[PDB]
Amino acid sequence: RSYGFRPTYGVGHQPYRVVVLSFELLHAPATVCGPKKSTNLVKNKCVNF
Amino acid sequence: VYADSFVIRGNEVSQIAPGQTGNIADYNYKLPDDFTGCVIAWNSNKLDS
Amino acid sequence: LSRLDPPEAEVQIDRLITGRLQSLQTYVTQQLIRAAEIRASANLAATKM
Amino acid sequence: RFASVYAWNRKRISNCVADYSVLYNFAPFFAFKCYGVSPTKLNDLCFTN
Numbered sequence: 001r002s003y004g005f006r007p008t009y010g011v012g013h014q015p016y017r018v019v020v021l022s023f024e025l026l027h028a029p030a031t032v033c034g035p036k037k038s039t040n041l042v043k044n045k046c047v048n049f
Numbered sequence: 050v051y052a053d054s055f056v057i058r059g060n061e062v063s064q065i066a067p068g069q070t071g072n073i074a075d076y077n078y079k080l081p082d083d084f085t086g087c088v089i090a091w092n093s094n095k096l097d098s
Numbered sequence: 099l100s101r102l103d104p105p106e107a108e109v110q111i112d113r114l115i116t117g118r119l120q121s122l123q124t125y126v127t128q129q130l131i132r133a134a135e136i137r138a139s140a141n142l143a144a145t146k147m
Numbered sequence: 148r149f150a151s152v153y154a155w156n157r158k159r160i161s162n163c164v165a166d167y168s169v170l171y172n173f174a175p176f177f178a179f180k181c182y183g184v185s186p187t188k189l190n191d192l193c194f195t196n
Binding site: 003005006007009010011012013014015016017018019020021022023024025031032 | 050051052053054055056057058059060061062065080084085086087088089090091092093094096097098
């Protein structure tokens with residue numbers, strides 16, 4: 001059944017378009033990520049890997 | 050990363066939350082208890098009314 | 099688990115588990131202290147025997 | 148007929164089946180906020196008053 005979505009309806013019945021972004025926060029591999037880039041590592045230096 | 054998309058009532062978006070109760074949360078779209086991600090909703094009266 | 103919804107009863111279950119574990123750790127500590135006392139008493143009794 | 152916020156009307160309900168499914172079924176009922184209980188379990192619980 002439908003609500004009708006008539007213009008006389010208020011915010012309680014006006015249509016809202018909804019999107020649900022479901023993420024998986026595991027760091028096993030990497031699909032999408034933020035834009036960032038830096039230099040290479042060092043073999044025997046204290047680095048924030 | 051997955052993205053679900055739909056259109057509902059304006060205030061019915063109150064039911065779009067992990068493990069809530071209601072018509073949508075039980076018979077149309079149910080989120081898991083351990084859901085993590087984002088939910089966005091915006092007006093669509095200019096299009097869907 | 100029959101009055102409240104899963105996503106809002108998880109915190110209550112967690113608090114109950116925390117309370118029942120805190121009430122059991124103290125019991126285990128008391129049992130250890132009394133077991134050490136009984137061990138000392140039994141060593142003294144064996145020495146006297 | 149609904150009274151004002153002061154001298155509010157109060158009605159006792161007993162000796163009947165409480166089918167809450169017809170309560171959140173109404174469209175204008177946007178606000179449905181329960182404390183100490185979830186809407187999914189209202190049809191499964193029992194009340195003494």
